[model samples]
Target chain A: ISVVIAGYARSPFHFARKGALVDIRPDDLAAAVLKGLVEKLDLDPALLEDVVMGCAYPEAEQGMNIARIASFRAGFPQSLGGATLNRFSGSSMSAVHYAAGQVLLGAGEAFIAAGVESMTRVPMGGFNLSPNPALLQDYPAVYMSMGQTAENVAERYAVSRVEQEEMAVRSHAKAVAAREAGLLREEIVAIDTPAGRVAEDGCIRPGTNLESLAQLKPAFGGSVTAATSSPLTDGSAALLVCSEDFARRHGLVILARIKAVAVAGCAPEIMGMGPVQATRKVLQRAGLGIADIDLVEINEAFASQSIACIRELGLDMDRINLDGGALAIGHPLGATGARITGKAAALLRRTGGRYAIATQCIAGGQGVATLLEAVEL
Target chain B: ISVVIAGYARSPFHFARKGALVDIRPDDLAAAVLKGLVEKLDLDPALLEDVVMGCAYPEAEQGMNIARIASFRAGFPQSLGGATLNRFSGSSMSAVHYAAGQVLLGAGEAFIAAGVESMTRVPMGGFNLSPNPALLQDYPAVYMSMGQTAENVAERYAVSRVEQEEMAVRSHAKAVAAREAGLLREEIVAIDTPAGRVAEDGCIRPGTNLESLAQLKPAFGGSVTAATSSPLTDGSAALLVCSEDFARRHGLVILARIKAVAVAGCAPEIMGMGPVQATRKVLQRAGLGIADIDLVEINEAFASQSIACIRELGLDMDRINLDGGALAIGHPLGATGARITGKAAALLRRTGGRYAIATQCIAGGQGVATLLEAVEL
Candidate 1:
């Protein structure tokens, strides 16, 4: 039996510390999205087999099984249980992979894969990462700052500053277009909070131009500037997943069939090349090629790495990120994976696409990719 | 496709803050077990798809995707990716479930389910869970101290102090016997640290009896006594899991086929009843009765909860925890599930049992149960 996406939703990605979600807790944001998912799907919360929330920084406000806490906070019965997963930037997609795993194993009929991150409340590294003298001496590459890693990728791939700046400009242009067309509303959940409403992405610079982007200095003493790098953001995303048997038997809508998935490691310095490796593995496993994918959503973690991936894997430029990506939508680490998944699902519905792949470059030299087949009905 | 346990190993559990592992970092301990598992399994480390580590307090040393840190430390290839999971007491078992999910979903052919905890370095709540003022008012049950939860379960189930003390005494007795018989050595990996070698459980009280346990002061100002509770300990455990194809192709010994698994929530006050609820669900799914289980490894988080579960579920005392339990052997929180899984696998091998169940009651109002069938691979 196939494990397919029945429904999906995501909170508006907001600029960290300055956006409407600044004061909200990560789990609270996730709860809001989870509540919305249940309501939108119009299903009994108790029927959910489990809930899994993924995050990059799972400390402080996001610690201690946030999904379990979210289940109750979101009005689910105490009888419902869930878990939390962390795979850095790939965490949310990993959460979906986990739910699909359970359905395929016949351990559950349905599950909620959720993700949230409050970069405004917590620092980039959620918890203190004091490497022991040994960890520092032995595994030095693991300690490189993400910006440094991005620079390393840019240097190795020879991606120029001009190209990176142009990519960011196009990203914002596409996101602005998609928003005006009301395409984002299909998957975006408006979060009502005491601070006001977080209805749309607050980071997209609709009027961004390459000249202004090029004026910014490098973030890590390299070519990666503010214009080319994904900013700190706060957001939440979620999706309802069900086994083929359960969906068909219950007459639930099938969004897409999770066709293929893969995660691969790369040199810690050039960690942005993770998707280049991960995509190849999934391509072989799913028996699909870059040309076969009707639409692609490669997380714009950094212009350097995103460009490297496209060039290395020969992904068609026109088929990628038509609704923009992390550069414009904001990459809230954990939530970005599900955000991309949500966007891809909606994109597939509109374009009548058969296949879509959501890919991301993770911190600590890792990359992950998920391939899905859109369902017409 | 069936998911099966191929190989398992665990560090010798030691008393927290005053044990052999006190000075050893949690990732180091986890790394030792993971490295040993790969060598013992006779498989290429790169072939191991992912390593999922379980931990309750994932802060300080255990943060930033500690599982991935352990993989690199354990000498895995750079092409390896991993994730960390938390579900309190059920984290390690949940880790195995996550790995099983990946295998079942065709995402990977194999994975390492590992766990670690350094109670010596981090507090029980990791980063001070100073019950949110609102949480105290909203989820008053969320603040139930583990000890308080145990007492609540005992009070609700009418479990007497005598029964709890008696159970603790037997737990020590059996653990002592198992240690003396050298049975635990099969799954334990010796760690040679700067402090010294840790090769045996240091918490087992070979000379303890019911009379001694009865004299212990009540913990948490309640019927739950120190002697009857699982100790604060430090350790790590790991198990290599693979899909049916990988195991058969590699001619690996299948320790047990993961037959059924379930996790459920309960009232926080009587959180100990989680297993009873989860067990019923698994039994119904697997179509098995209590009598069909040749052995049961029930985590003795607290004698109060263990006895309550036994009485409520009609579990056979003779078939449960014949090698002692957490009250005697110690519970390292995150590591206990994989440790118990390792113990259960060894016990089944010795008894030639057809089926065995490893289960635990979570601290935060949840219970998880996994049904494994011993197969002659």
Candidate 2:
């Protein structure tokens, strides 16, 4: 019961609040990508068992199980239900993990793992954010801001401000290079909004440099600054996953096989370090080592944390964030997992990479990672 | 590879805005239930892989991945991650299904499938209720109100007002009977709140009768009235699910093994009919028929829809909702799935029933059903 990635697509990531996707609703954005993914695969909508969507902030426009709403918006038959999951930045990846879990357990053969976020409409922390008083009193870190956690990581790992600025500069440079080379376009499906068609990511700055990043003031009272932190964005990403037998039966080309998935937690104060534990667990589950991975798409939530994770896990910098990451492309929170996972799959298909790892550090001290193996067939 | 339920517990379901549990925040309520469940199992919390919680309206006090917040509030180690799921009324059952899927797939050893809803704090449609305009224009039923859908089900199925009222009366009568006999007590866990220590479900009315219900006018301009509809409620429910090997190794008692689970969809206009398709799918997946199920706990969202499902599926009347359902116990949206599933499992264990089916119609034209088989040991 091997789980395989049959198809994947994503809407171009855009700046939040005032971006091209600002006017577009989350469900509509998600539906367009969902429809595009299905169409790209020449797959039958009836074959989909469920649409698992991830939303870090599931409220307002994205509330009431936006997954089902998006499925309906996509004109899929009523037979395909939907489940929305929340695991912060790990959301859509968790969506993929759960959808693949169903296939691996013989619960269903086909599932759509997806994620969407409209930071423009639904602000971070949500509209009515409230924490438990007792819990907050006992463990105040549970409600610690993500930026604060990144600062904690930076201090503990001795990540200098210069290193953080350098990473931010490299993130933009790599993203600009990938975009110019048309490598990042493979997974993106142009989306239409009131402002017009959104076909390209708007966050990558081709002129970004270490000097420009160094001039920025600290946004969270630490080495991490606005330039180093991933920008809030609006976007959606989706993947069509099926059992190996289902793929063969449907004549769907298998892009990659999901080798393993792992979710681990750490202290909420040092939440960015989550990817280290998660990557290790996933590699162990796959009976592989970091050396066996040919590519890594670890989310760059913040330059400091990303560098800390890379150093802590002893991962080669050259093999990580091959097409830039959240730092350069913007982070739409929930949609990132699917975007990176799909991007990794597409990269592997083009580069003939044997193995790839997609991982992200989650809010509230958690991390999630998925191991993908390029399919020969 | 068997998925088993090791323990279950639920907060007393109470009237939404003005109930004993209203003053309690959703996270606090959920955490109390989660803590109680773990303590009841006497299981080491370290062995738990994840806490998957369902919340229909994941916002405000219930938002920010309430599963993780509640887990932290429950005083669990931060090493255990959490996921929040949404599929409307099917939310928590989907949580259970997904958690069980993880265990069955060898992804993890144990997970807590739980749900919480604070309708008093988070309104039904949530704070921001915006639907896709194109979807609304093309498929107006996608955002159809639950009561309107119930009306559609009654009109299409030819379910009369008298039959709906009779079922409502019977629901109350049976709930009262079960409460008096202490049959419904097994799954409920008392909680202390600002109001006081809440123990009993206030929604159950022993004095409810056909005559009293007849006086109420049609609440949705249809055959259904207020009495026939499930009341708005606030509560939380949780179940500890683990693989058979894990349960055996931990020396935990297995109440029931998750035999099969299915989620199916139908026209949003007749959303209540969703259970029929979902139940049928689950039965087919298990290679069994309705007759083979010793007991059925079909959610009584509305007597009209409940009776329609029973007649449409040709389920034995005596075996359905043997004790009671949402009509008497109240429906807390996200929590109903876990409550019903736990109730069914508890009933199976108590009555020595070989099999039980827990099925519910989701708000957005979806249905989810979980088949549970009582464990001999």
Candidate 3:
């Protein structure tokens, strides 16, 4: 019951320069990634069983079962089913884990697990925001802006401006180095934007300094600042999963084998630490220790909680996000999980590493983590 | 890689009086069913990997990831993930198939597949009506009313008013007899209402005859009439799935195992015959003859399409809807598939049947079917 990553693809991360509106819709971006995957992998579109996309703002161009629309647009057969996971937070990675599970269960021979967001087209919270009145009534903080939660984590974890900026600068340096080394060239699909064929990650500010980050004002009206938080950016990523037997039969290159995945919940007030709890469960289930992981891609949802999780779990900072993290690459809600996993898998393959861990802190005090191993050809 | 149906449960279906709301919200109904299931099966909710729910009008009481809401309300641990499917047409059965595939892959040890709809709270097309403009532009008939689809099917299939009314009269007669014989007593759950515990299927009109149906005018105009279509109803159903080894380790009852599932698409203008194409795929996959099925639950979406499918498939009419179909029962959109599947499983268990098939015609010219085999104790 093993599932292998057969192929992966992603659209170039786009940074909204000043007031330039996003031209590509989320669905269009997702379709572009899927099309690239089918073409690059030389996969038979008819073999796909389902298309599961992670989306946050499910309205307008990104809404109404965008997974199905993207699948159809990508030339997948009508017999292939599609679905979207818009349940706020950690959807990208969750969709991958979910799709992998389907492959293991014999439900699908091949599946497209993807996440997409066009921050310019569908800004966060553009869709209906009907928070559960009952939950809000019981705990006012349940509906608190995510920034406020980061502020709480900062206060609780004693994260400071210096520490935050140091992490941010390192993130940018690692991302720049990864790009320069062509480590990400294989996984990232060049997006045909109106400007040009954009391929590089856009959020990394390579020359960022601690002094500049320290001077920025608080973003959540407390102590949290922009440099300490994952940015609202636009990007999409996808993975093709199939059974081990199917992979061998098809003679497809295997990037990694999913070992185990786990999701967990915690108090909503400190929701950013979800990855820690979920990671613990996944590692425990896989019978592995944190030190046994060769690489880690912890989603830098915010400096406060991300650092807190690293410290609490006693993880070696040197092994984690060696190629930067979400702080510099953007957190596109539903796409973050899969994007991070894609990056981690690519890193494992390039380094010939045995193991890699990917984790994400979701909204609503939820955490999810998956353990993966590089597959030997 | 086979997935087993370890357990299943359903909330009592109730008719919401015009302008009279029920205390239990759609999510609550889902939670109640899951709670009942967990209590009955003595399952640790934390072990569940995902909660997948099929919902039609995903807004208001059932909005913003009702599947996750139900999981949270039912006290499933945060690590237990959830998702909602809203493509409409046959979500209930689709959710089951999706969950079964996940279980087969070992993504989850135990999973909950459910469908819920409260037409009383949120009517059809309530939340977002943002249809794909491209689809509309290419085929305006894609959004044609369901009644219009029925009318089109009737005209193409050469079905007359007398034939449709005869089917409706038989539907009511069969349902009334099933009620009298207590055939549905095992499957029906009683809901606590202000007046009393509402237990019976609400849409059954035992006294209805061809003459009575002929007296009613067409609901959607242009040929099709009220007598030929199913009514809006409120209901919910759920099933618990796990790997065979896991079920055996837990010493759980195995009701039935899903053999195969297939989805198909046709021209949207003739969308009502979706089940016909899907059933063909399922039969081919299961490697079974149509006559091998002991019972068939063809969602009586409309008499025209239902009769057409039966005639075209050369199915045993006597073995179809022995109790009643959607016409005399109800069509609660998202819940219809699970409801029918639940009944099919319950009936198979009671009658010692070997095989059963459940099918539904969906929106946008899609159809889905699942074949099941009775589990030997």
The DockQ of predicted model 1 stands at: 0.66
- DockQ scores of the candidates: 0.66, 0.74, 0.38
**Model 3 clashing residue pairs (backbone):** A92-A334, A93-A337, A104-B105, A105-B104, A105-B105, A263-B79, A264-B79, A274-A367
Residue B282 lDDT, candidate 1, scale 0-100:
76
**What are the runs in model 2 whose C-alpha is more than 4 Å off?**
none
B-chain TM-score, candidate 3: 0.93
TM-score of 3: 0.90
Expressed as tens digits, the lDDT of each residue in A1-377 for candidate 1 is: 78788888988889898888887877778888999988887888888888889888777788777888777778788787788889999999888888887887777799998898889977788666656556679878887888898888889899998989989988999999999998888687899878788788899999999878878877889798988999999999998878877777767778788888888888887888989878887788788888888888999999999998999998777888998988999998888888787677667767888888888888878888888887643
Q: Chain A in model 3: its TM-score?
A: 0.96
CA displacement after TM-score superposition, residue B43 of candidate 2 (Å) = 1.6
Full candidate order by lDDT, most accurate first? 2, 1, 3
Worst 10 residues of 3 chain B by lDDT: B12-21
Scanning candidate 1 chain B in windows of ten residues, the lowest lDDT window is B127-136
Off by over 4 Å in 3: A15-21, A139-144, A155-158, A190-200, A245-251, B14-24, B39-49, B75-79, B126-128, B139-145, B155-161, B182-200, B220-223, B244-253, B284-287
Which residue pairs in candidate 2 have backbone atoms (N, alpha carbon, C) closer than 3 angstroms, thus clashing? none
For each of the candidates, give the backbone clash count: 0, 0, 8
Candidate 3 lDDT over A86-204, as tens digits, reads 65557777777767755654455778788887777666765465655555675565456788888788788888767777888888888888878877687877777676677777788
- Model 1, which residues run further than 4 Å from truth? A249-251, B128-133
Cα lDDT, model 2, residue A350? 73
